[PDB]
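Build the 3D complex.
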Amino acid sequence: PKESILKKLEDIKPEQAKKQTKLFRIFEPRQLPIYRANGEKELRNRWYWKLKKDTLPDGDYDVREYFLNLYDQVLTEMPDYLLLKDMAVENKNSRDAGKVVDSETASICDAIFQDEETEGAVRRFIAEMRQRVQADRNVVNYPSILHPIDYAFNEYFLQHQLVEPLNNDIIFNYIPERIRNDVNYILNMDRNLPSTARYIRPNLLQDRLNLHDNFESLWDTITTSNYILARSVVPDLKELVSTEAQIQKMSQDLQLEALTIQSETQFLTGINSQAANDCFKTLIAAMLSQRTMSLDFVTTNYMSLISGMWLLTVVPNDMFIRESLVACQLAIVNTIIYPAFGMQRMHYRNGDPQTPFQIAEQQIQNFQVANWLHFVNNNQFRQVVIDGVLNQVLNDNIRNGHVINQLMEALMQLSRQQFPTMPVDYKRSIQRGILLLSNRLGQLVDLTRLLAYNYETLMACVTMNMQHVQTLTTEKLQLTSVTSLCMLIGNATVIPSPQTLFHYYNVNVNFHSNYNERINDAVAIITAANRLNLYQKKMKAIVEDFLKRLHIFDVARVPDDQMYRLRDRLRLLPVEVRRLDIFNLILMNMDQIERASDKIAQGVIIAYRDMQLERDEMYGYVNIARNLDGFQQINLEELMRTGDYAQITNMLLNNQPVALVGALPFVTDSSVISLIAKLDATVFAQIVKLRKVDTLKPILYKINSDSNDFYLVANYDWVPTSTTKVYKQVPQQFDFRNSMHMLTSNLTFTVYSDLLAFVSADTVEPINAVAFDNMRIMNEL
Amino acid sequence: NQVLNDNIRNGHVINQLMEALMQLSRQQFPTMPVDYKRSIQRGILLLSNRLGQLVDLTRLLAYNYETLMACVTMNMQHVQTLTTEKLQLTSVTSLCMLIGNATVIPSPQTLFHYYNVNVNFHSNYNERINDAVAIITAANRLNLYQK
Amino acid sequence: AQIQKMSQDLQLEALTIQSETQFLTGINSQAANDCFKTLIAAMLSQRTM
Amino acid sequence: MDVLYSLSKTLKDARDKIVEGTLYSNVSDLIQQFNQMIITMNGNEFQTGGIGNLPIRNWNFDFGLLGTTLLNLDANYVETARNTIDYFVDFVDNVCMDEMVRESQRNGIAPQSDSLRKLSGLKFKRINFDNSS
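Done.
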């Protein structure tokens, strides 16, 4: 309760400064003996590429999901910016110091630089391989070895760095183009930014989610929030006629007595040393958050009504609920304006729907009275766009802002109907109250000014493009307080503290940034989620996290519904270049990763026909085919899903040349023997007994009579006759020279969070402030 | 198998639902006190949003009935029973906005068991029928004018 | 969860004199199962309600 | 086409019902209709003319709305309006004339000008009214 949504709000710091150290790679080169055709180890040994972590699954599906997590890890580690002075390392060799990039880089060199390799050209290169700085442009040249796929990564990380410059001018510019402009306030800074500055652009695009169309439930929660936020600002008022004094002259001016009541119920309204401040705050926030309030009055508290007219003249009515403006107006129309304006006859009969206030317009005649009606009735909000960047602000009719000829007119109309009558007395109590508005009018003129400004000020600070809808939790406001605020003010002038204002900006800011950001985080995922065919990662998942990261919301305490509809809208959104640009990268090569690396394969072919084996250098000559040219196929993923249509069962039974595809467990064997016995024709049996298969551990034959104690056969003369080889590309080799890449980045940066702070915001003397009319706000003494 | 069916439309083509909703999406207007349309339409929307899911419901039944049904020997003409079976809109309403990506069906073993029963039963009915008839007819050409 | 967002949406107590005769909705974790079953059998069985 | 029509009874029932004096109520149903238009327009560009001795003029739209605020129209209200109508007048003229010259056999009936072919567009239909001419 109350200060329970504020501590959750003030306590929001999405401004994390993401950065990195380790150059993100995936494959470290490794050893392994060389097998020259004929199957002998020729020594020296060559260098190939395998992956750090062969995690890869069992089943195409589990595979795809796996990668997915990579995406999430990539984003959480997503390097916001980058710098290399912090990446230094040393080269054991070279024309000198060497200072290169990332431990791994180092290791490798020293390593190859010992195990007698291709000789010269390598040692040589490693040598005159250094760094150098082009100081002038603040540029940096650091050498580094990676792998086509690695350069790929880290590269874009450099060509992207979301860190724009930072000059005095930009600081000045992020201070709303309507406040620096506002006179009454003054800026001022204590330092001069270096050419070395930078800043993170907290992006704040609009409600890419039209969260007001049908979702009411949540808007209400927002408004609420934005509202409390507001009160936390709305300047606490200053010095106003001591409670007692006023209320005492109050009893006087009216003339009271003994069991002779008339106006006596108009002062359970005093308490304003509380009410005025509440009524004041409450009113603004309402506007800002653009929340809708209710109305608690009496029908015997006429005064309380009069002041209503004050209110009404102001807030465009649409700002209050329907069932409330209805009551109010008719209450006025029926017990306030007819019953002393010899207009009764029909105490006004009403039946709901249409506009019970309005109708009073085309009703009786009198000009003063008549203008009020049109001005109040058809008075709305002015829908205004841009405000020094898409603010999408709702403003109050220029007219009203201090050029309050409305108040003066609201009074003149009151001064003129206090003429005719009907029930003899009654008028006494009624008009007496009316006059208390008149005298005070000199001051009432003020109140208007106040709000006028304040709302009109605070405003700018909102980046949360507020709109105009019906709330639902409806904040409550009594005519009690209203009335107090009214006759109880003047001579005073109050205004938004500097520090206060910023704080306001800052918050909405963050918040925005978070919304926008998570949005991107969200989208990115879902889209990836589709071009993955994960018809099994039920999305009730993403939405949840999303909302959560936006505190305030009782996640568990909100249905599965709205949630889905939420996806439906997200799905139709683009991705932030950053996000997107990376996924394209992951996919594009995806294949290459998978296929390489052990612990898996791809698929197996069963040609009931003897056949040769490739002689690749890595392994001796074994069971492989990077092409599977011909034969039919059968997705396993679509198998253990389809429930196997004995299609496979039949083909296996009848022995027909065929193949399989997907995630698979390889199994290495040696002792030639196994081969001649044609062992690999086994395994396949299983299946028949078990519709589903994973129990399928396919066969491979790493064979080089060098390491295979059973060489006896390489002897005679020969050629490897197998039945059924394996789909699995082969780990590219390692051409160091070209396997390296070069890097650029910057030197001695300087990141800054928050900003603003750099200003001793001071204020003029209250007694002479100004509004959008260049006039002294508060001049009546 | 006289097993009164129903719209492929209903089946999974579902749309009726989509139309049941679209028709709802344009009922938001005046006439009486405010505490009315407010409360009313707000409820309606809860059907709408959920509509994405309400769809699923149709599918569900569509299948289930359309499935179970199969294993019924006992023909089934439509008749006006003499007894009702109370159904509290209470539950109805729940089921409605209260179902998510759930998806259940008839366990194999379950289905058979169903067939089996109707089967037996049938067989019994039919059989006793014969047992019955046989007797009565004999009963007449035996002049056993009694039972 | 649902019934709570329900009150947010529903605007429960708003003047009307006959409250809490709309929320006997409960025991739904069950009601749905009953309503569901009940509905099918009705059909199959060739019952009327 | 029907579009075109409105654009006029709009102005006539306008340049006629809108003058120094009248009480709002005789035009509430009118003002509205009017504004609606302005909106749909603003932003779009038009090509009028380009044949014979016919001036080729371009037209941009960026105009305000109306003050439903006042009661009995004050002179000042009119002038700030007439000035906005006189662009539509001098416009429509250049519009009618442009499609009042082109002809075609096959599809002679339908609209021809780069001005009108864009009017039959869907995003405009939000304008029709009082077709008693």
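Residues 1-781 of chain A form one domain.
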